[PDB]
Amino acid sequence: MSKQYINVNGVNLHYISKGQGELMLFLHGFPDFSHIWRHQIDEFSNDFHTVALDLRGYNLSEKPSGLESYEIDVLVEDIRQVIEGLGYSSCTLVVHDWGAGIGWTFAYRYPEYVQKLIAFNGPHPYTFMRELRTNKNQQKASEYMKWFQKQEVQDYMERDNFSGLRKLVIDPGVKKGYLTADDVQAYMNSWENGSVLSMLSYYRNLKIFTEEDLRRKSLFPLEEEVLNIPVQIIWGNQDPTFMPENLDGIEEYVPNISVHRLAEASHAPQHEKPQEVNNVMWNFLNK
Ligand SMILES: NC(=O)COc1ccccc1
Ligand SMILES: NC(=O)COc1ccccc1
Ligand SMILES: NC(=O)COc1ccccc1
After folding, report:
1. Which residue in 54, 190, 206, 250 is a FRET match for 60, CA 20 to 30 A apart?
2. Sequence-ordered list of residues with C-beta below 8 angstroms from that of 43, at least 6 positions apart, any chain
């Protein structure tokens, strides 16, 4: 396991790496970081060059100032440049949460850069906007996104030894038994080293708050309405963040899709049920 920086699109991003061969690139979301992919890295690094990126703003990655530095086009370009910078023209892209918001958008725009997409809980660009418009449960579930627009949010997340973040991801994971003591320390270190401000900046560029923005077909601007590469969804049904109906009718937008639903996994199946997840991944990668 190697840990290093790569300079792309005007920033230095930290990533962890293991193995060699075809690139399997993992994108985490909020408030995680590259470490959340540890079990997939260990599983696949004899078959792939497994690389888990820390997104800009997160953990040891550079934390550029200003909201403009966290706009979708910039984040998408980060991904393109990371792929090329590592020496590849395409990859197997594995994504979750904000990394899925970015990763889906990337795959729609650059399907030539993605051999296969594996997506965990997170917003599909078309179905998410539909669910925000019509699914009262999704609307309630996504209320915190309005709250995140507010300057007061960071203190709730950081105060008392990151109490808000601990409550969000640590306490559920320790209680359910999928976080070790070293995992907890790794998360706490990621929050000391990273910037919660930068993490929140991602949300503060979201266009889902005006009646006009809500009208748009995709979460982020896209000319492409179909993605035809092979795609696997691996979804925790108990996720309080994204309702299961986000998967409804998804074939219209992603014709070659396979879906695996974990009845008793929540927001982050990749580390909640790594063995089940890993076998589903093997199966998809081999078919
Ligand atoms: N864990 C989270 O709150 C992330 O939620 C979102 C992630 C991406 C785009 C919109 C919302
Ligand atoms: N109820 C609506 O039409 C809008 O709902 C939401 C829109 C954005 C974030 C949270 C909720
Ligand atoms: N990261 C989030 O916003 C949600 O985090 C979790 C939520 C429920 C169970 C596990 C993690």
Report:
1. 206
2. 274, 278, 281
